[PDB]
Structure formats: structure tokens, C-alpha cells
Design a protein around this ligand. Structure first.
Ligand SMILES: Nc1ncnc2c1ncn2[C@@H]1O[C@H](COP(=O)(O)OP(=O)(O)OP(=O)(O)O)[C@@H](O)[C@H]1O
Ligand SMILES: Nc1ncnc2c1ncn2[C@@H]1O[C@H](COP(=O)(O)OP(=O)(O)OP(=O)(O)O)[C@@H](O)[C@H]1O
Ligand SMILES: Nc1ncnc2c1ncn2[C@@H]1O[C@H](COP(=O)(O)OP(=O)(O)OP(=O)(O)O)[C@@H](O)[C@H]1O
Ligand SMILES: Nc1ncnc2c1ncn2[C@@H]1O[C@H](COP(=O)(O)OP(=O)(O)OP(=O)(O)O)[C@@H](O)[C@H]1O
Lengths: 515, 43, 40, 213, 107
């Protein structure tokens, strides 16, 4: 039938309907008002081409189709291959000659056709097939179907019109197709109630990504095997249940285990890191953070709504261990733009200058396409490797950055750039500080009150110790970065409770310094 | 460019066949009978 | 590989057999021509 | 007549249990429930690992375990022949008997086992090969067609081993042909103890080992 | 009728002793104890070093050592051939006699 699912095939409904429309319309259409003799199917392995061929052969009320299993033609003797191939078309010629137009349809199946078609034997066989399919005598009662997994390895002359006309591609099924396949393969279980009530097909369909029919059927089979082994004991003499075999319920846990351990999509995965750039979150230990975030929002809206300033840039300045990159990441994520990316030197290790330049160019080219986008660059000095001795650095990357900082994108699109560093004077000397439009300052912790507030927010010390720390600290000024503070706290907590405080304070005295 | 490259192996192909040789036997057999006939006529 | 060594031997042996058969047929044909000429 | 102990495989315990579960559970239980449930049996195994771990031992022991016809062995590239179109005949000769049995006795026939050794010496990627002769491509295509073709053959089991799993062409390693692809590796302390105990049993049996060990 | 002095090799006492121990020790003893001990023999030896030190000499002298069949010898790459699947044929022709004799006479 044309339902396409009574035959236990899913996903290819549209392709099957296309085959109906383009293939058998002439034959089913009334003869009075009134062909195609070539079909080629291709697609990745395990999509069901054999199923389509078999079901199409079964559907038509015609003689039994003939099939050849790969290269069963080549023979060490000369001319026997030609005799074998010619042996196939005898019945079609006889029927055409005797019954003329009123001749039954003939169906021929070429399995692994790429093997034979692509040295004298091979090209002679190809020429013989080309002549027979389309030669001096024209037949209108023969149908040929070829199947391949490597469409590129097929000869072009075989694909010309009149020989191979209808070309079909079988692809990976969609969620609906996966649902249909699971329904087909689990209808048998549901009929006899052997399936558990805890299994939800929709959850599996959502979970099963990029699983062709093979993958899904194999997962089902693995669940069967798990349930099946649950009722057998191996060691002395293989012995089975025979008792709970009646129940043999298939739980969802079996499906999960089969999906986890003994199945794999066989497709590559995508790795994300944007989360990794903010590990411990943000804590409001003082006013400045709010000011920084407000300025970020102001710049975001200026780039969003401006009409004749499509490009805008900002620079983030601060002393080391002041937590600069995290703030940039937070602002970028708050921007809520379709396209966001982070360029870091972490991924470029051992690269020469040209590689760095090309990577930056690629990132910016990708950014250009979208409507409005934002990009962030961190550790500029590490990007253009710099050393106080000499000094020494890379000129090429510096020129690339200077050029890229003031190139407007194609018409009607918006770009934002945020840069982070910790050595302003150097950038000023290199004449780069002029390129940026504006700058922001990220300070350290100055007064003991802020440090106490940070400790309170962290909640790693109790009131008793906090009293001594307040006594020792409130009468003095401090200078420390947040990252160093966390490192110091973790350092101190190692020792026994009695000494922690003193140790901690000692460490503070070691890092005590002024700007 | 590429240094000189070796050639690949050869795969010959025998011509004559068992069944084709049965057919050649079909060819040959009638000749002896025809010879008996002509010898009879001459005699 | 003596398993296939014998297949090659059989092939070449039948080549020799076919050669002998052809030569015998040719000699026959010549004898026929001779006798047919003689009767006249 | 079989037992786990007598095979004598020390360091592989989870692996063999997994093999049994995922390949043989189907053919043990009564046919009634299987037929009711309408599933198909597996038709392939692919082992691999670094040299000298126990692959071939495992394959031979598996072959010994079953009560069926003698397995057929293919020692390396012993299929290739010089006469054109002769390799495929050799390949098809292997499955001829299984096809005959399946046709004759239908669905209640015995089992047949085929062991390929050093498989990667034959089945390399079709595209990536010296474009000099087409014999290898024809061989691979013949094998692919015969193992899973339009005609359905379902009373055969094929095992393969190698040392470089990557080179095998992907079309062969998908479910329905060769799905259970395990890995053998170096043992752990307990595995080493088990192996040492295994190989020392007979000495202890005949009191030829000093107590000081 | 063998004697060590007969082979006329000098300066390689230790190496010969080790090779003898690890290769031919198993096959010389009464077989009952070996069988009870349940081991299999060793079937490989490799020799390497700089040119001109006495490798081929050892190979030839060991060949004349044992009471066995005439050894087969392969002079470098004598097995390569132009046709397809012939090299493997020359290789597999080497082991035929051992295979058949093992299958016939067993141990
Ligand atoms: N859409 C599907 N519906 C049902 N079964 C499917 C489907 N796709 C694959 N299968 C399963 O896969 C097998 C049929 O796939 P088939 O052998 O025809 O695949 P192919 O992609 O044409 O082959 P190959 O991998 O050799 O190129 C059967 O097990 C069938 O159950
Ligand atoms: N309010 C905050 N501001 C910044 N970072 C914070 C804040 N609260 C917690 N953190 C954590 O502090 C760490 C900041 O370290 P970060 O890598 O941003 O430092 P940095 O200034 O870029 O250092 P460097 O110049 O050495 O690379 C992150 O773990 C972040 O989660
Ligand atoms: N797990 C094991 N338990 C007991 N014996 C073992 C084990 N693994 C290896 N052996 C022993 O060591 C040898 C293993 O040789 P085997 O041929 O099985 O290894 P292999 O993996 O096939 O080698 P290759 O990688 O060269 O093919 C045999 O003598 C076997 O008895
Ligand atoms: N230990 C030795 N005692 C006595 N004579 C020796 C000894 N070693 C070498 N010779 C003499 O020197 C010759 C060296 O020949 P030999 O076969 O040892 O060379 P080789 O090691 O095979 O050479 P290559 O390393 O180039 O293959 C011997 O034939 C013998 O005459």
C-alpha cells in the first residue's frame, strides 16, 4: 500500500511519495491517454536501501525480480562474462518480440553495482551493459535498480539520460522518523505486553541523536539481551531460569545501560569552554563591580542602537590577579547577542606568527556574517608574545590587530570588541592605546572593610577568628587581588585549626604591599 | 618530482575452458565419422 | 599453494590436449582431401 | 561437557561475560519466546589489541566450546590468486555450504563458524589503496554482498582479529555485520596472579615446585 | 659422533652455552618428566651484530649439529615474484612438510 508504514519503513515517506509520483505514474495512468528504465539509490550505510528495493519489487504485480550478488560476472575465460550478461535479457527480448506492448514488466536488481562498473574485461562489460540497456533495439518493459554507498565511484556515462534516470538519496531520519522506527520495532513487544510501563519512547527519541535505523534497532536488541541475561547463570554448566522467563519485563534501566556502555553514535562531538571562564562566579565585595557592569551595559546599548558608529571598542585595565577576564565574560554573556566568541592564546601553543594571524582572521570573518556580534580578546601581551628584555615581540600580529581594530563590517551590521590586559604603559608606547575608543579600570581590594566583607561572603572563617582578624586588619591598609586571596585561604586551611589564623596572617604580611 | 615508481603485479587470464573443450570435442568427433564414410566411398 | 598449483597444471594440460585435438583434426582434413581427390 | 575453568583464560572475565551476554543469550533459551519476540541474532565479532594478549587463544577456545561443525580457518591473505576473477570463487566457496544448509533445512539447521585471522591484510578501505589493480575492491565488494545481501542467510557466525582497527573500512563495521567490537589490553595485578596460577598448576600437581616460591 | 672442539669456533663460549640451555635443553632429556612438567618448546632465534663476527658460522655449525633433515635455506629475498599472490605461495611452500608430519605422527 501507499501508506509506506504498513511495510515497516519510517522517515522516507516523502521520498517514497516522490518515487510513486515520478516512477509508476505512467504505468498506472490509463493506457489510452498515454518510459523510465533506470534507478539508482545511494546513501550512507545502514539506511535501508535493500528494504526499498525488496518492497518495490514485491509491490508490483510482475515476475520475480532477478538479482546479482556483487561481481558474479568476471571469469578467467574470455567472453564468458559477455555471455553471462547477455543471458539476463533473453526473456525481456522474447516477451517484447512476442507480446509487443502488452508485455509484463521486468525488474533487475544490481547489488553493489559500483564493484563491476567504474582492464579490458571491465570496460568491455561496461560497454556490453550500456549497449544492452540502451542499444539499437529499444525495450519498454524492463526496470533496473542499482544500489551504492559510494556514489562518486560510479561511471558518468552510465548516469546519462535514458540509462539511469531516477536518482535517490537516503539520509539520516528525523525525530519523527526515529519515533516511527521505534514504534515499528516495539509494536511486537507492545502487542504481547512484554514491555515495561516505565519506558517512554519520546524520551528515547529525543536522546537518540544521529542514530540511523541500524543504531536504534541495535539499542533495542541490546535491551533484549540485557533482560535475557538477567535470567541465566554461567560458570559450571550454562543454566537458565525457565521461571521468570515468563515475566522478562524490559525496564528503562536496561535501555539506559545499553545506550551508555555498548552503543555509540560514531559521530564527532562538540566541546564547550565558555562556562570554564567563570568558575567561582561573581561576588559584590564593593561598589566598583556595579560601576563596571553599568558601563558595560551602556556600551552595549550604544552599539545596539547607534546608526553611524557601527563599530565600538573598549579596553579593560587592571593589575595582575584582579580578575579581569571573568568580568569581560560576564558582560559578554549579558549582552545577549546571537554571535559571541572568545579568542584566547590557550589554544595556540607552539604556533608561528602566520598561524596566529590566520586564526584571528578566521574568527573575525565568521563574526562578520551575522547582523550584530561581540568579540573579546584577553591577555594581549601573551597574544603578541612580549618580553621585557630587549624588548622583543612579534610585529606581524601587532600590525594585524591594528588594522583589524578599525575596519567597519559590511553595510548595516554591528560589531563590538572588548580587550583585556594588565600592562597599559607598554601598549601606550606601541601606539595602540589610541586605537581603542574608551577604557575601564579594575582595582584591587584596598581597605580592611572590603576584605572582611569578602571573607563574610565566602564564609570560611567563624566569628571567633574573624574578631582577631578584624582587630589586626582594620587599623591598616591592604593591597591584594581576589585570586591571590582565594589561593591564600586554601593555603591556610591545610594546617590544623589551632594555627590556621596565625599562618593566614603571616601569609598576609608576606604579601603586604602598596601601589 | 616523484622518483621512478615500480610496476604492480600482473594477473594473466587463461583462454580455453573445460566446457568450451567439450564443444571442441563436439567439433572433432564428427570428422572421424565423415572420414569413415569417405573411405567407404573410395573403397 | 599446491592446491592452486594443480589448477594451473590442469589448465595447461587441457591447453596441450586442445592443441593435439586441433592437429588431429587438421591431419584428418588433409586425408579427406587426398581420398576425395583420388576417387576421380 | 564444558566448564569455565577448563578453558584457562586468566585476565579476561568481564570481557567473556559480555561476549556471552551480547552474542549467545539468544540461542540458549527456548525458541518459543524468541519467536514471539521476533529478534535477530548477531553475525560478527571483531577483537583487537596490542600484540601478545590472548586474542587467538580466545577465538580457538570459543570455537571449541560450541557443539557444531568444525570451523573454517583463513590463515592471512591465502585467498588471492593470479587468474582474473578467481578470488571471488574462493570467497563464495566458504558460504556455499551454509547457504545450502539454510535452503534445505530452513530455520532449524545447525551452526557454522568462520574465523578470519589478520583480517586487515584483505579488507582495506576501497578508496585508499594503490590504484593499480582492482582485485582488492572486488574482494571487499564480494564479501560485503555475501555477508549481508538481498538473499538472507542467518545461521552463520564470523569472528575477526587484527592489530590496527583503524584501517578497516567503515561499511563493514556497522550493526548487522560486525557490531560487538571489544578491546583486549594488558592485565592488572589480579590478572597477573590468575595467569601465573594457571600456568603453574601442573607443577603443583606433581610436586615439582619448591615450597619457597 | 659430535665434539665441541670439532666446530672450531673461538671466543663465544658464553653465548653458545646460553643458546644451548634455552633451546636444546628440553629435547635431550627423557620425555616423561618433560611431559609431566607440561611445557612447549622454543621455536625462534635471532642473531645481530656488526659485520664479520661469526653469525653465519654459528648458523652453519648448528645446522651440522642436529640429527635432522637437511635444512632449508633462503638467500635474502628469493621469494618475491612478479605475479599476484605468488610470494605468499613461496612462503607457504616452506612449512608443508612439518605440517603433514605433525598431522601424521603426532608427538
Ligand atoms: N528506516 C528503517 N526502518 C526499519 N529498519 C531499518 C531502517 N533503516 C535500517 N533498518 C534496519 O537495517 C537493516 C536494513 O538496512 P540495509 O541493509 O538495507 O541498509 P543499507 O544502508 O542499504 O546497507 P549498507 O550499510 O550495506 O550500505 C535491517 O536490520 C533493518 O531493520
Ligand atoms: N567579583 C569577582 N570578580 C572577579 N573574579 C571573581 C569575583 N568573585 C569571584 N571571582 C573568581 O576569581 C577568579 C578570577 O580570576 P581571573 O582568571 O579572572 O583573573 P585575572 O585578573 O584575569 O588574572 P591574570 O591576569 O593572572 O590572568 C575566577 O575564579 C572568578 O570566578
Ligand atoms: N589471558 C591469558 N591467559 C592465559 N594465557 C594467556 C593469556 N594471554 C595470553 N596467554 C598465553 O600467551 C600466548 C598468547 O598468544 P596469542 O596468540 O593468544 O596472542 P595474540 O594476541 O594472538 O598475539 P598476536 O597479537 O601476535 O596475534 C599463548 O601462549 C597463551 O597461552
Ligand atoms: N669466532 C670465530 N672463530 C673463528 N673464526 C671466525 C670467528 N668469527 C669469524 N671467523 C672467521 O671469519 C669469517 C667471517 O664470516 P662470517 O660468516 O662470520 O661473517 P658474517 O658475520 O656472516 O658477515 P656479515 O655480518 O657481513 O653478514 C668466518 O667464515 C671465519 O672464517
Amino acid at each position: 500500500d501507499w501508506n509506506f508504514e504498513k511495510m515497516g519503513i519510517g522517515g522516507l515517506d516523502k521520498e517514497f511519495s516522490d518515487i510513486f509520483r515520478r516512477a509508476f505514474a505512467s504505468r498506472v495512468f490509463p493506457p489510452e491517454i498515454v518510459h523510465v528504465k533506470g534507478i539508482l539509490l545511494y546513501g550512507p550505510p545502514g539506511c535501508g536501501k535493500t528494504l526499498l528495493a525488496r518492497q518495490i519489487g514485491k509491490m508490483l504485480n510482475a515476475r520475480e525480480p532477478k538479482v546479482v550478488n556483487g561481481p558474479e560476472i568476471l571469469n578467467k575465460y574470455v567472453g564468458e562474462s559477455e555471455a553471462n550478461i547477455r543471458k539476463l535479457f533473453a526473456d525481456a527480448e522474447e516477451e517484447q518480440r512476442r507480446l509487443g506492448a502488452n508485455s509484463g514488466l521486468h525488474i533487475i536488481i544490481f547489488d553493489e553495482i559500483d564493484a563491476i562498473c567504474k582492464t579490458g574485461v571491465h570496460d568491455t562489460v561496461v560497454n556490453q551493459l550500456l549497449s544492452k540497456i540502451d542499444g539499437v533495439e529499444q525495450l519498454n518493459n524492463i526496470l533496473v535498480i542499482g544500489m551504492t554507498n559510494r556514489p562518486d565511484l560510479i561511471d558518468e556515462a552510465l548516469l546519462r539520460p535514458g540509462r539511469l534516470e531516477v536518482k535517490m538519496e537516503i539520509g539520516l531520519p528525523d525525530e519523527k522518523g526515529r519515533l516511527q522506527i521505534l514504534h515499528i520495532h516495539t509494536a511486537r513487544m507492545r502487542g504481547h505486553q512484554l514491555l515495561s510501563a516505565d519506558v517512554d519512547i519520546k524520551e528515547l527519541a529525543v536522546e537518540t541523536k544521529n542514530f540511523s535505523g541500524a543504531e536504534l534497532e541495535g539499542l533495542v536488541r541490546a535491551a533484549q539481551s540485557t533482560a535475557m541475561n538477567r535470567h541465566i547463570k554461567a560458570s559450571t554448566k550454562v543454566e537458565v531460569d525457565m521461571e521468570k522467563a515468563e515475566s522478562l519485563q524490559v525496564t528503562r534501566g536496561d535501555f539506559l545501560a545499553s545506550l551508555e556502555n555498548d552503543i555509540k553514535p560514531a559521530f564527532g562531538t562538540n566541546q564547550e569552554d565558555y562556562a570554564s571562564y567563570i568558575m567561582n562566579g561573581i561576588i559584590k565585595w564593593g561598589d566598583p563591580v556595579t560601576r563596571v557592569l553599568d558601563d558595560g551595559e551602556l556600551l552595549v546599548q550604544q552599539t545596539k542602537n547607534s546608526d553611524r558608529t557601527p563599530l565600538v571598542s573598549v579596553l579593560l585595565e587592571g593589575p595582575p590577579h584582579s580578575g579581569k577576564t571573568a568580568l569581560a565574560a560576564k558582560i559578554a554573556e549579558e549582552s545577549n547577542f546571537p554571535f559571541i566568541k572568545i579568542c584566547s592564546p590557550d589554544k595556540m601553543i607552539g604556533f608561528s606568527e602566520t598561524a596566529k594571524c590566520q586564526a584571528m582572521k578566521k574568527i573575525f570573518d565568521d563574526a562578520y556574517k551575522s547582523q550584530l556580534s561581540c568579540v573579546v580578546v584577553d591577555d594581549i601581551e601573551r597574544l603578541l608574545d612580549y618580553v621585557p628584555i630587549g624588548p622583543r615581540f612579534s610585529n606581524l600580529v601587532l600590525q594585524a590587530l591594528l588594522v583589524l581594530l578599525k575596519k567597519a563590517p559590511p553595510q548595516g551590521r554591528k560589531l563590538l570588541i572588548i580587550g583585556t590586559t594588565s600592562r597599559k604603559d607598554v601598549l601606550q608606547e606601541m601606539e595602540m592605546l589610541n586605537a581603542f575608543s574608551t577604557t575601564i579600570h579594575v582595582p584591587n581590594i584596598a581597605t580592611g572593610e572590603q576584605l572582611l566583607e569578602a571573607l563574610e561572603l565566602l564564609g570560611n572563617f567563624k566569628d571567633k577568628e574573624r574578631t582577631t582578624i578584624a582587630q589586626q586588619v582594620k587599623g591598616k591598609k591592604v593591597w591584594i587581588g581576589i585570586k591571590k586571596l582565594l589561593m591564600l585561604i586554601e593555603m591556610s586551611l591545610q594546617m590544623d585549626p589551632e594555627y590556621r589564623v596565625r599562618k593566614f596572617l603571616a601569609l598576609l604580611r608576606e604579601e603586604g604591599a602598596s601601589p | 618530482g616523484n622518483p621512478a615508481i615500480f610496476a604492480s603485479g600482473i594477473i594473466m587470464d587463461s583462454s580455453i575452458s573445460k566446457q568450451a573443450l567439450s564443444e571442441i570435442e563436439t567439433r572433432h568427433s564428427e570428422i572421424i565419422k565423415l572420414e569413415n564414410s569417405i573411405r567407404e566411398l573410395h573403397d | 599453494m599446491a592446491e592452486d598449483a594443480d589448477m594451473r597444471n590442469e589448465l595447461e594440460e587441457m591447453q596441450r590436449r586442445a592443441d593435439q585435438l586441433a592437429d588431429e583434426s587438421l591431419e584428418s582434413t588433409r586425408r579427406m582431401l587426398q581420398l576425395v581427390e583420388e576417387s576421380k | 561437557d564444558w566448564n569455565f575453568e577448563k578453558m584457562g583464560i586468566g585476565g579476561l572475565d568481564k570481557e567473556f561475560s559480555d561476549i556471552f551476554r551480547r552474542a549467545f543469550a539468544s540461542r540458549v533459551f527456548p525458541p518459543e519466546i524468541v519467536e514471539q519476540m521476533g529478534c535477530k541474532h548477531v553475525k560478527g565479532i571483531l577483537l583487537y589489541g596490542p600484540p601478545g594478549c590472548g586474542k587467538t587463544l580466545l577465538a580457538r577456545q570459543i570455537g571449541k566450546m560450541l557443539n557444531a561443525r568444525e570451523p573454517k580457518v583463513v590463515n592471512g591473505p591465502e585467498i588471492l590468486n593470479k587468474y582474473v576473477g578467481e578470488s571471488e570463487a574462493n570467497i563464495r566457496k566458504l558460504f556455499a555450504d551454509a547457504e545450502e544448509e539454510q535452503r534445505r533445512l530452513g530455520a532449524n539447521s545447525g551452526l557454522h563458524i568462520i574465523i578470519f585471522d589478520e583480517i586487515d591484510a584483505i579488507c582495506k578501505q576501497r578508496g585508499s589503496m594503490a590504484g593499480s589493480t582492482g582485485v582488492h575492491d572486488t574482494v571487499v565488494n564480494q564479501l560485503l554482498s555475501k555477508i549481508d545481501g538481498v538473499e538472507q542467510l542467518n545461521n552463520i557466525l564470523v569472528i575477526g582479529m587484527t592489530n590496527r582497527p583503524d584501517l578497516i573500512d567503515e561499511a563493514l563495521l556497522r550493526p548487522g555485520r560486525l557490531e560487538v567490537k571489544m578491546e583486549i589490553g594488558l592485565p592488572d595485578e589480579k590478572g597477573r596472579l590468575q595467569i601465573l596460577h594457571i600456568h603453574t598448576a601442573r607443577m603443583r600437581g606433581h610436586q615439582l615446585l619448591s615450597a619457597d616460591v
